[PDB]
Amino acid sequence: ALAVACGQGSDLMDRNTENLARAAFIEYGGQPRLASVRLSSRHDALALYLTRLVRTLWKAKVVQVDISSTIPTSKLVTIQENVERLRNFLEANKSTIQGLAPPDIANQKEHQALHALQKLMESISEGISFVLMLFDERVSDIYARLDAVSQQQLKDLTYEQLFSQTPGKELAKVLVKAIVNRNIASGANVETVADALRRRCGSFCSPDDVVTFKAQEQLQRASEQAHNSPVLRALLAESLRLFEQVAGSLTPANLTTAVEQYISLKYYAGAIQLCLTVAQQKDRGN
Amino acid sequence: SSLDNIEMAYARQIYIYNEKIVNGHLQPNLVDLCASVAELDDKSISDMWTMVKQMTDVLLTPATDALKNRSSVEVRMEFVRQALAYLEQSYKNYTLVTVFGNLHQAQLGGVPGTYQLVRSFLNIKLPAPLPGLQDGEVEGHPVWALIYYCMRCGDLLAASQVVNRAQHQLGEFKTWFQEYMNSKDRRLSPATENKLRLHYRRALRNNTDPYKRAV
């Protein structure tokens, strides 16, 4: 019923059938009970459907090392669409489906269980979007300019780990921090790759990182335009504005790369002012 | 001495220009004699003389009255072209320093073709796609943005290349544009000029693609 309600079988009246399927999912889904709890058949059905949508992904490695993707991109798209249509179905019926809205111990764990599944769904969609973003770039190029531990972590990274384990999230945060670096070398567009990472895979990307990426953009593009005289004083001055904003949140690894570049461009006095500013914003109370 | 560094350098240049006329020599280019000092100052002044030279570098009628040259429609027309050529080239330098941090930086790697420069200019000034654009894209950018900033830089050829790769999408605009690039003085024939204006005025007076409106 859940599947039909989400449009499955419709690749073959159809609104009424899907509305009937919705009615069957609500009316006959059961309820949670004390036996440790026994969750409703409605919950197990949602878990069963979701699992079967990602069964080809879960235990599979993300990549195959000339690195490529284990799962074809076209398959990742359809899986994501199916997960999203399931999410859309739960949102449009948050008020009528038991357990979605907040509610005694039985209905409590029913709400917690259903909530956890929905958080996994959005994490699945974010994870898939991240993999698609990754292979839109030149991963082999990114994979080359990488440390061994992170190459090994990426070698045996599964979709399960990407979706549900901190190391996948931490590694994802490293890869995004690396792809933008490379994107700046190609230099097609920084602010487009920004809004790409900002929204779709939000909750995994950080807005303090994109402003940093915007700063490293002008820095590298100030090294690109380095031969020009009057164009840099606008690039380096605007890079400095971007750095000082995220001063209370710059990593020592980035702050160094910034100062290293400033010295190449004889921007001595400016680089000193950034480090002084980063200091005060890490310890405002002095 | 009551003369500042800049003023003094100009005086020396005006002494040369006088020494030349006092000894009967060739009348050298005064505008060049003044820009020689400008480079010793910030580019605020250099870019001025660049405009002065290009605005005065018009074919004149030697030994003709001043008022006559400036009233003649002949000369008044070339002024507009010399200015447009300055605004286009001036903007083209803005597009370079926007992509590369320094003019020198752009030069070492080589000034890219006006088409690839403009494309590498759209990447920055519009990173995300505006939802009001029309007529699709061309190699990853809206077709009308490319046409505008190419015309803005003054490379009509680069703009026409963009049109050639979107023949199906742009409709009848191809035969109209190809005439604009051919006809001199940046003007179309009254008949064809009438055909496009009425079409734009008909249902495109307010279109969601500003670049389309501009072109």
The H or E element containing residue A69 is strand A68-69
Residue in B43, B97, B127 closest to A225 by CB: B97
Q: Which residue has the tokens 């991109």?
A: A73
- Quick check: A192 and B123 CB within 8 A? yes
The H or E element containing residue A63 is strand A63-64
* Contact residues for A227 (Cβ-Cβ < 8 A; gap 6+): B100, B102, B103, B104, B105, B106, B107, B108
SS3 A279: helix
- Quick check: B103 and A227 CB within 8 A? yes
- Quick check: B103 and A228 CB within 8 A? yes
Cα A265–chain centre separation = 35
Smallest CA–CA distance from B100 into chain A, residue: A225
The CA-atom distances, in angstroms, between B65 and each of B58, B69, B73 are 15, 7, 15
Q: How was this structure determined?
A: cryo-EM
Give ∠ CA A199-A180-A129 in degrees, rounded to 5: 40
- Quick check: A231 and B43 CB within 8 A? no
The H or E element containing residue B41 is none
Nearest to A124 by CA among A173, A92, A159: A159
Q: Following DSSP, what letter does each residue of B47-68 receive, concatenated?
A: HHHHHHHHHH-S---TT--HHH
Separation between Cα atoms, residue A178 and residue A213, nearest integer Å:
10
Residue in A192, A196, A228 closest to B97 by CB: A228
Q: Which residues of A fall below an 8 Å CB-CB distance to B?
A: 187-196, 218, 221-232, 234-236
Residue in A189, A222, A225 closest to B123 by CB: A189
In a mutational test of the B interface, the residue from A228, A232, A238 whose CB has the highest number of chain B CBs within 10 Å is A228
Chain B nearest-CA distance from A213, in A, is 13
Smallest CA–CA distance from A222 into chain B, residue: B101
- Asked if B209 and B144 count as a contact pair (C-beta separation under 8 A), the reply is yes
